[PDB]
Amino acid sequence: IVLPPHLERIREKLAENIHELWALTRIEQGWTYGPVRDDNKRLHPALVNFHSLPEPERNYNLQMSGETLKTLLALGAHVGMADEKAEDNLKKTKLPKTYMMSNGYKPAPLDLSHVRLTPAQTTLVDRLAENGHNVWARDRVAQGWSYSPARRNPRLVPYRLLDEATKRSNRDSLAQAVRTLLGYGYNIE
């Protein structure tokens, strides 16, 4: 079931904030920019503005954001605009210059400190995490979705096989995705 047209804008904004959060998480752990990945020196080429990612990487991120939204809908959630003023009123987290990369990129995820999941929303985050298509893309160090010798990609690790710490990282990523939607003024019921 394709993503409804009225959720296409939020698919883009969601992917952008997920990238900012991912980049922050990496930079906290000592990662810095370089054009070729180096896991010993912790250099990563994705520590750039979202719009400056290679098109295939941007497209993958948009696909993953869209599949969070489609999985919410498959779980029966009602997702719709409720507060048209919320987006204008959003602010970004202002990090110190110690978070800026050599290319001038500094992450600026949304300040969602005011957002509080309702019980039904907490339950939807839990059901997203437990859904059979949820994976940890271990090489991307990120939550993602897998929707369709060796056919399967073992590096997309099903949630049910993760150790507790990585389950917690995966679930928290989905919590921030849902809180991002709420921050932009969507109700989720």
Curated annotation (Swiss-Prot):
The N-terminus is blocked. Channel activity is modulated by phosphorylation. It comes from the Eukaryota. Sequence repeats lie at residues 1-95, 96-189. Detected in skeletal muscle (at protein level). Fast- or slow-twitch skeletal muscle. Disulfide bonds: none annotated. It is found in: Sarcoplasmic reticulum membrane. Belongs to the ryanodine receptor (TC 1.A.3.1) family. RYR1 subfamily. The calcium release channel activity resides in the C-terminal region while the remaining part of the protein constitutes the 'foot' structure spanning the junctional gap between the sarcoplasmic reticulum (SR) and the T-tubule. Pore opening is mediated via the cytoplasmic calcium-binding domains that mediate a small rotation of the channel-forming transmembrane regions that then leads to channel opening. Cytosolic calcium-activated calcium channel that mediates the release of Ca(2+) from the sarcoplasmic reticulum into the cytosol and thereby plays a key role in triggering muscle contraction following depolarization of T-tubules. Repeated very high-level exercise increases the open probability of the channel and leads to Ca(2+) leaking into the cytoplasm. Can also mediate the release of Ca(2+) from intracellular stores in neurons, and may thereby promote prolonged Ca(2+) signaling in the brain. Required for normal embryonic development of muscle fibers and skeletal muscle. Binding of [3H]ryanodine indicates that the heterozygous channel is activated by Ca(2+) concentrations 4-fold lower than normal. Single-cell analysis of cotransfected cells shows a significantly increased resting cytoplasmic Ca(2+) level and a significantly reduced luminal Ca(2+) level. Homotetramer. Can also form heterotetramers with RYR2. Identified in a complex composed of RYR1, PDE4D, PKA, FKBP1A and protein phosphatase 1 (PP1). Repeated very high-level exercise decreases interaction with PDE4D and protein phosphatase 1 (PP1). Interacts with CALM; CALM with bound calcium inhibits the RYR1 channel activity. Interacts with S100A1. Interacts with FKBP1A; this stabilizes the closed conformation of the channel. Interacts with CACNA1S; interaction with CACNA1S is important for activation of the RYR1 channel. Interacts with CACNB1. This is Ryanodine receptor 1. It comes from Oryctolagus cuniculus (Rabbit). The chain holds residues 861 to 1054 of 5037 of the full protein.
